[PDB]
Amino acid sequence: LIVPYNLPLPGGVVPRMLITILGTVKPNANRIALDFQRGNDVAFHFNPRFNENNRRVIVCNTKLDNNWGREERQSVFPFESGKPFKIQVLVEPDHFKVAVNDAHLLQYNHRVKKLNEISKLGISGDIDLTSASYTMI
Numbered sequence: 001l002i003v004p005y006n007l008p009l010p011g012g013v014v015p016r017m018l019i020t021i022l023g024t025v026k027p028n029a030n031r032i033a034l035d036f037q038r039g040n041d042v043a044f045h046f047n048p049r050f051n052e053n054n055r056r057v058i059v060c061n062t063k064l065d066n067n068w069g070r071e072e073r074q075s076v077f078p079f080e081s082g083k084p085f086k087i088q089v090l091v092e093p094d095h096f097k098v099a100v101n102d103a104h105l106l107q108y109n110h111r112v113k114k115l116n117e118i119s120k121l122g123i124s125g126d127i128d129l130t131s132a133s134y135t136m137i
């Protein structure tokens with residue numbers, strides 16, 4: 001698939017929706033981003049950074065009216081340059097639950113509460129994208 005990739009989420013997200021993204025991190029990758037969008041707002045930005053001041057960190061945030069909010073940072077970093085990955089995002093009633101390569105990684109509490117209006121997922125960054133799909137569990 002071509003990156004950046006936009007995956008429509010028809011009728012928005014709902015609890016029990018599972019989104020699965022398969023791809024490979026490019027060699028010498030700098031960043032990856034998943035952006036769950038509510039119009040111009042970003043309800044959930046998931047942003048692995050491979051070199052922020054020589055550290056590897058995952059930054060999560062929300063953008064409202066073009067302003068970023070308080071960052072939530074995770075030091076556990078399961079991505080590896082050059083290697084294949086699987087990201088699974090499970091929508092639960094009160095948070096997005098993210099697993100990478102079948103291991104739980106983090107939860108992100110819903111800041112944008114109109115879940116039905118979060119109707120696009122943007123996938124960008126330094127990856128080769130193999131598949132992006134959803135199902136109900």
Ligand SMILES: OC[C@H]1O[C@@H](S[C@@H]2O[C@H](CO)[C@H](O)[C@H](n3cc(-c4cccc(F)c4)nn3)[C@H]2O)[C@H](O)[C@@H](n2cc(-c3cccc(F)c3)nn2)[C@H]1O
Pocket residue numbers: 031032033045047052053059060061068069071124125126
């Ligand atoms: O919040 C999420 C956003 O972050 C800013 S960078 C942000 O800039 C701020 C200044 O305005 C702060 O410096 C902030 N910061 C650092 C620290 C800190 C704390 C401790 C140590 C340490 F070093 C650093 N605390 N706060 C930065 O994270 C990115 O541009 C933005 N973004 C990313 C992308 C994007 C576009 C395309 C692909 C892609 F993967 C991402 N498109 N917009 C998005 O990811």
Ligand SMILES: [Cl-]
Pocket residue numbers: 111112113114
């Ligand atoms: Cl809202």
